[PDB]
Scaffold this active site. Sequence first.
Site, PDB file in Angstrom:
ATOM      1  N   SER A 200       0.853  -1.199   0.000  1.00 43.47           N
ATOM      2  CA  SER A 200       0.000   0.000   0.000  1.00 43.47           C
ATOM      3  C   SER A 200       0.884   1.243   0.000  1.00 43.47           C
ATOM      4  CB  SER A 200      -0.979  -0.134   1.172  1.00 43.47           C
ATOM      5  OG  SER A 200      -1.284   1.127   1.740  1.00 43.47           O
ATOM      6  N   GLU A 325      -9.337  -5.510  -3.860  1.00 45.63           N
ATOM      7  CA  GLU A 325      -8.591  -4.372  -3.330  1.00 45.63           C
ATOM      8  C   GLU A 325      -9.503  -3.322  -2.717  1.00 45.63           C
ATOM      9  OE1 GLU A 325      -5.567  -3.707  -2.710  1.00 45.63           O
ATOM     10  OE2 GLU A 325      -4.411  -5.248  -3.791  1.00 45.63           O
ATOM     11  N   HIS A 438      -7.699  -5.728   1.036  1.00 52.00           N
ATOM     12  CA  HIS A 438      -6.446  -4.987   1.076  1.00 52.00           C
ATOM     13  C   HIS A 438      -5.675  -5.274   2.357  1.00 52.00           C
ATOM     14  CE1 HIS A 438      -3.948  -1.613  -0.234  1.00 52.00           C
ATOM     15  NE2 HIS A 438      -4.107  -1.010   0.933  1.00 52.00           N
TER      16      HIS A 438
HETATM   17  C1  LIG Z   1     -11.289   8.468  10.127  1.00 53.71           C
HETATM   18  O1  LIG Z   1     -11.494   8.901   8.813  1.00 53.71           O
HETATM   19  C2  LIG Z   1     -11.135   8.040   7.762  1.00 53.71           C
HETATM   20  C3  LIG Z   1     -10.250   6.998   8.007  1.00 53.71           C
HETATM   21  C4  LIG Z   1      -9.861   6.135   6.980  1.00 53.71           C
HETATM   22  C5  LIG Z   1     -10.369   6.303   5.679  1.00 53.71           C
HETATM   23  C6  LIG Z   1     -11.264   7.361   5.426  1.00 53.71           C
HETATM   24  C7  LIG Z   1     -11.642   8.226   6.470  1.00 53.71           C
HETATM   25  O2  LIG Z   1     -12.532   9.257   6.237  1.00 53.71           O
HETATM   26  C8  LIG Z   1     -12.538   9.918   5.011  1.00 53.71           C
HETATM   27  C9  LIG Z   1      -9.788   5.270   4.780  1.00 53.71           C
HETATM   28  O3  LIG Z   1      -9.977   5.183   3.579  1.00 53.71           O
HETATM   29  C10 LIG Z   1      -8.900   4.411   5.595  1.00 53.71           C
HETATM   30  C11 LIG Z   1      -9.323   2.950   5.490  1.00 53.71           C
HETATM   31  C12 LIG Z   1      -8.115   2.014   5.700  1.00 53.71           C
HETATM   32  C13 LIG Z   1      -7.760   1.900   7.172  1.00 53.71           C
HETATM   33  C14 LIG Z   1      -6.629   0.881   7.387  1.00 53.71           C
HETATM   34  N1  LIG Z   1      -6.987  -0.451   6.893  1.00 53.71           N
HETATM   35  C15 LIG Z   1      -6.097  -1.583   7.287  1.00 53.71           C
HETATM   36  C16 LIG Z   1      -4.731  -1.561   6.604  1.00 53.71           C
HETATM   37  C17 LIG Z   1      -3.702  -0.746   7.090  1.00 53.71           C
HETATM   38  C18 LIG Z   1      -2.443  -0.735   6.473  1.00 53.71           C
HETATM   39  C19 LIG Z   1      -2.219  -1.543   5.373  1.00 53.71           C
HETATM   40  C20 LIG Z   1      -3.252  -2.369   4.880  1.00 53.71           C
HETATM   41  C21 LIG Z   1      -4.500  -2.376   5.499  1.00 53.71           C
HETATM   42  C22 LIG Z   1      -7.431  -0.347   5.498  1.00 53.71           C
HETATM   43  C23 LIG Z   1      -8.535   0.678   5.273  1.00 53.71           C
HETATM   44  C24 LIG Z   1      -8.919   4.931   6.992  1.00 53.71           C
END
Ligand SMILES: COc1cc2c(cc1OC)C(=O)[C@H](CC1CCN(Cc3ccccc3)CC1)C2
EC number: 3.1.1.7
Lengths: 527, 527
Positions: A200, A325, A438
């Site tokens: 990522s 993904e 993912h």
């Molecule tokens: C709090 O606000 C928000 C927080 C997040 C988004 C949008 C938000 O608002 C717009 C996202 O789009 C993110 C979603 C990812 C969070 C981490 N995981 C796990 C992961 C971590 C590291 C590598 C692989 C997987 C995947 C989804 C977080």
Amino acid sequence: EDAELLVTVRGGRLRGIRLKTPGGPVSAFLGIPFAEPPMGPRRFLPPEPKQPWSGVVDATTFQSVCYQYVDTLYPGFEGTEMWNPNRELSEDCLYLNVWTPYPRPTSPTPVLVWIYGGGFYSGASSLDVYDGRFLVQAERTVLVSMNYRVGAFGFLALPGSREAPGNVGLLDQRLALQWVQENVAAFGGDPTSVTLFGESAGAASVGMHLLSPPSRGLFHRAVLQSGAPNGPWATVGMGEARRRATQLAHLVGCPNDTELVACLRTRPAQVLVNHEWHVLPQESVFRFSFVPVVDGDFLSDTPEALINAGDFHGLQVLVGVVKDEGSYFLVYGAPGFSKDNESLISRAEFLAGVRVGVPQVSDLAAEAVVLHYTDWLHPEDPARLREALSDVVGDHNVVCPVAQLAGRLAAQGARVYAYVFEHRASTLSWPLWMGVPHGYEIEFIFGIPLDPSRNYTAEEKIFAQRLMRYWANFARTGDPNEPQWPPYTAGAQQYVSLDLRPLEVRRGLRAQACAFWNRFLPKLLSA
Amino acid sequence: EDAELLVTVRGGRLRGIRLKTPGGPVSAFLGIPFAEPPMGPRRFLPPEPKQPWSGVVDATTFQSVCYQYVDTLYPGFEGTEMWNPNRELSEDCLYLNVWTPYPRPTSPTPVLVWIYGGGFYSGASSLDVYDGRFLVQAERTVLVSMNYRVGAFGFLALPGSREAPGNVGLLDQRLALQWVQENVAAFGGDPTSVTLFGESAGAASVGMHLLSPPSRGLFHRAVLQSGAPNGPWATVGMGEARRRATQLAHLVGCPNDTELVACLRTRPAQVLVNHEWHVLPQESVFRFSFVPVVDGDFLSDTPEALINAGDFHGLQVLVGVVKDEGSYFLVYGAPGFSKDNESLISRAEFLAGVRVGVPQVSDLAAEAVVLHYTDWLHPEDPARLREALSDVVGDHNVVCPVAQLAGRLAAQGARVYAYVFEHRASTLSWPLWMGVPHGYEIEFIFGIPLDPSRNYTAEEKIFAQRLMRYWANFARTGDPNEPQWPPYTAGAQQYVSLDLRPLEVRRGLRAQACAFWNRFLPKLLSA
Ligand SMILES: COc1cc2c(cc1OC)C(=O)[C@H](CC1CCN(Cc3ccccc3)CC1)C2
Ligand SMILES: *[C@@H]1O[C@H](CO[C@@H]2O[C@@H](C)[C@@H](O)[C@@H](O)[C@@H]2O)[C@@H](O[C@@H]2O[C@H](CO)[C@@H](O)[C@H](O)[C@H]2NC(C)=O)[C@H](O)[C@H]1NC(C)=O
Ligand SMILES: *[C@@H]1O[C@H](CO[C@@H]2O[C@@H](C)[C@@H](O)[C@@H](O)[C@@H]2O)[C@@H](O[C@@H]2O[C@H](CO)[C@@H](O)[C@H](O)[C@H]2NC(C)=O)[C@H](O)[C@H]1NC(C)=O
Ligand SMILES: COc1cc2c(cc1OC)C(=O)[C@H](CC1CCN(Cc3ccccc3)CC1)C2
């Protein structure tokens, strides 16, 4: 004392620790300082090399996690918590970790350098899923992983300013790679065989080091898992970086670029984190406030431009994606989605979801997306709509940026291997409708299934061993092969599926979808 | 004398002929004048009703074909010659034909009225393939067909002028339909049951009568075969009609609208025809110089708007297409195509062909076409490229205008039946790669296989009898059914395949393709 756990690096002496693994011991040197703590006046500045120390630095435990947002979405759910910090937060966080076989190799051993992902706003080298102990024992490599600054501390940019130049998190990574060049031999590693791998934002980082000449001399091979530097989330332009930096200052009571950064430096780290998401201009998933900025310095041009114009002869690269993904991201903002129901959305929710997944594009571009991803014989079928929105987010953010990178590199001199990871872990806590989400290939690449305290199946253990062998083969030779895994080319577009069955060679990384995102949609946006 | 062959209509007495048919005798009245000859001062003017005559007009042979270009592409090849005039050319051409059972029906009988196609520049009611004798004898209908002016004589327009108002070819058709209302009862026909049917430009003509209120009171049902009034070739705007008219005048030596038309009225018919194709602004296939003009008169607005805004309750419609609407057109200008080889084109020829098939659109629009019709796993396979260009031309000109019309009509009160014609005639002279080409369902609808002098298989004779029953059933009842043929709806989108096998119900008239042409591409062209 055990001489195997005493090492002298250029800055002074280290004491490591001996670790158990189902296959035998490994030596680990955890929490090695590689930069001066970037605190106080140092916040937002490029890292400085760690000054030499007297005495023996205790390299026996993971150091602190760089300040970052903590995901509050499903409190106590292991699916979200496994990615959250598992050590205290601190800006004094620039430490790296070395794992080597026990006893230490006496002949130069190939080096893997892990760069963690997390959207450039989160991550840590200490997470359980990045434990290098299994790869090192099974495949007899040296493994290095570093912490690098994230969020505002890593990537807040006021372009042109000397106070907040941007990209310092990327310089944290470069500094760690220079550290590897200078000291990895002391741990039996070969500085002439360094393979970068990351997932990522870590993959996007790897790619950015490929396209930045000062970094390109610090490693020899590259692995990009579920990410690419040309991802629409991975860089921002100068003007939008300045606007985001300026809005963050405003939200925390600040205030001349110098005056603005100076006021920002007075704020507790946690205060910046508390307002980080609020500088995003529109409702979105898969978008992050502070990311690498294209300013002519670290990246002389956009990653897309740099990719299309590069000579990549002599480069071998391993890239790939998971089967689904996009699914993971839908529960962070797409209307109608939840991990706790089947998220069988309506057409109206699908349409609304498309603007969340492809933010800040013209209405015409959004209509083009809806055209491509609608089955016009079943325009309102909720299951097909759920899968389609997941494909939109996955194609646009990961698959098609990866396919473009792989196509250009192959056509311009690089040997490219491509995979789709199609195994859903028996242990996965996320709902079945998310498929293979993912991030959930990482635990297999690192051999986590071999941990007896965890509850993986016997063929999942064999699968992990296959994957470690593929990855380590590539690190040693540029070729994952020991049924054969062929190179990916722009014409044949061959890749392999990775699951419990033998290798199956297939064609096209979502070629129909990626023609739209990579060939047509840019043309539409320019006119 | 034979009393069955004498009929009195409002203009005077007529003498017909008795025709032999494999199933029994039929009465034919061929060459009935329905308008004053539109010659000299009358050229380009709306038609005037035929003045009554004394004595008996012999309606015993087809009258002349309206002046028109003659296809020279494959001289002596029956595939092209069968569509060419089989009577002398003349501007004195406004005659119609009635076929009725022998003896004349004793009770009011349903009337089928045929409008021939030919791109509005060619065609004639006398062609062998439009022989009405078989329909009349097999299904006990009254059949009417008329000649109407084509090319510049039918459709040259200087909009606003009284001297060349445009659309006189359509007024020719409307006058014939008024003749049917006033006179068909004298042949045993029921003026309260009149079904229009037509193919290609004839289908588009049928559609325009649906959208023009003065025509709508002259018929009850409609059949549109391989054409639609909203087709991109079937209408032109006011300004482009004026420009084409003006360039035609210029090319034949002519300098005020009245003075321009008067100069044109002095030119020999053949001289206007000789320059007809030169007024097309761009290289093209499936485009015709002089077509119906959107003038506010015959068409209150574009066919697309009139379709979208109309109440169609109480209307029954039968619509359909052949399997390969596009192939025929490629040998008239797409680079690399020929009836005499396999036309296995290159990618470069495909790209060039797309601009010929979709003329006068932005480069961006052309790219959108290339995106949708390229298989990006096989971007250069000549066979797939050949089939793709044919689909481009067939989808854009026929299938998707028919689908849009069928969908709108169903959703707005009309009962709609839809077909795809999938039988390739045993006797077909065109190469096998063309499939079932434009126009080659007509001979089966008219029952031409029952002619013993021709060399159709016995199964084709059975097939033609089935198709005549469907058409006559629809003509009598609004419903082709006696396996059942279900109505077409915007949601289920059901249609039947017509071939030697039994009815098979399918879904979607090229639905993915037609979403591009009907939903997305218009938004692109306006932006
Ligand atoms: C709090 O606000 C928000 C927080 C997040 C988004 C949008 C938000 O608002 C717009 C996202 O789009 C993110 C979603 C990812 C969070 C981490 N995981 C796990 C992961 C971590 C590291 C590598 C692989 C997987 C995947 C989804 C977080
Ligand atoms: C599936 O869940 C979403 C999200 O709702 C959350 O999770 C559910 C399991 C339940 O506990 C909800 O109360 C939670 O809020 C549902 O969409 C939400 O609907 C409510 C009101 O109906 C609305 O206030 C929220 O904004 C919606 N969330 C969105 C739009 O993201 C969705 O309806 C559920 N699907 C079902 C029940 O079939
Ligand atoms: C298939 O035929 C086309 C059309 O060419 C005509 O028909 C052929 C059977 C042959 O007799 C040609 O000489 C005829 O002109 C071929 O395309 C033509 O190629 C020539 C060059 O050789 C060129 O001058 C013409 O302009 C081309 N015509 C068009 C419409 O593009 C085509 O190459 C043939 N394909 C094959 C043989 O695979
Ligand atoms: C002389 O120039 C041109 C002549 C033509 C085109 C383009 C031209 O130049 C650009 C075309 O696209 C036309 C192609 C059709 C000719 C008639 N037939 C047979 C038919 C007749 C009636 C109904 C249905 C089928 C189908 C193809 C003619």
